[PDB]
Amino acid sequence: MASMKKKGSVVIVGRINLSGDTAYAQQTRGEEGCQETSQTGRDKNQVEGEVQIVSTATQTFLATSINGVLWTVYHGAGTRTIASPKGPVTQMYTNVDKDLVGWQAPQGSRSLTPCTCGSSDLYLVTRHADVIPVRRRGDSRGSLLSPRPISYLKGSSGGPLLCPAGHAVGIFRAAVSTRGVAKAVDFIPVESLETTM
């Protein structure tokens, strides 16, 4: 069929700045430039940092570099390429059973180190640069110390859960809610990433 369309690439549209004493979101590309970059797959913007804000034509979420792989959720990215300076980059990891995908980390990004602390005092980083204390409750669950409406977590899948030392403990996947209040989060453990690799 000569009519059949191709889905666009995932596009980096900003980042969560964790460099200093204050966490804050930065936008690096507007909606229109995102639209064109998604269709061409050609993204000339400089990439920095560990947590990227990413978008498709219809969804926005996060992606996190750990050990030289930019990781995110399958329910956001599907099987899509990511835009890069030389054109679309095909996924190097895809696992729908884990809700997980990964591409080679962009040039200029910084990678988080996988946590080996065994600590259960975690920190979730959201797309609004909120740093949310989370107590680990199992291999893939943690409770929010201060619950809040799921609205505040929407769009943060693909972001990191970090240990007190700033290592990557997991990738935020799903919210566990009661009457619209997020009491707990479900995440992909970093060990599951390390095994996928």
Ligand SMILES: COc1ccc2nc(C)c(O[C@@H]3C[C@H]4C(=O)N[C@]5(C(=O)NS(=O)(=O)C6(C)CC6)C[C@H]5/C=C\CCCCC[C@H](NC(=O)OCC5(C)CC5)C(=O)N4C3)nc2c1
């Ligand atoms: C298609 O192929 C696949 C393969 C595997 C897969 N595996 C999943 C677990 C999954 O789940 C769905 C997406 C996910 C998010 O919503 N993810 C974010 C998020 O932010 N997404 S997002 O906005 O960035 C978006 C949509 C990308 C743009 C983090 C939340 C934030 C708010 C959630 C509010 C309402 C939703 C509450 C819900 N809860 C829950 O399902 O609990 C289950 C469990 C743990 C047993 C009890 C929930 O979280 N999700 C539902 N889809 C798939 C799909």
Ligand SMILES: [Zn+2]
């Ligand atoms: Zn650690």
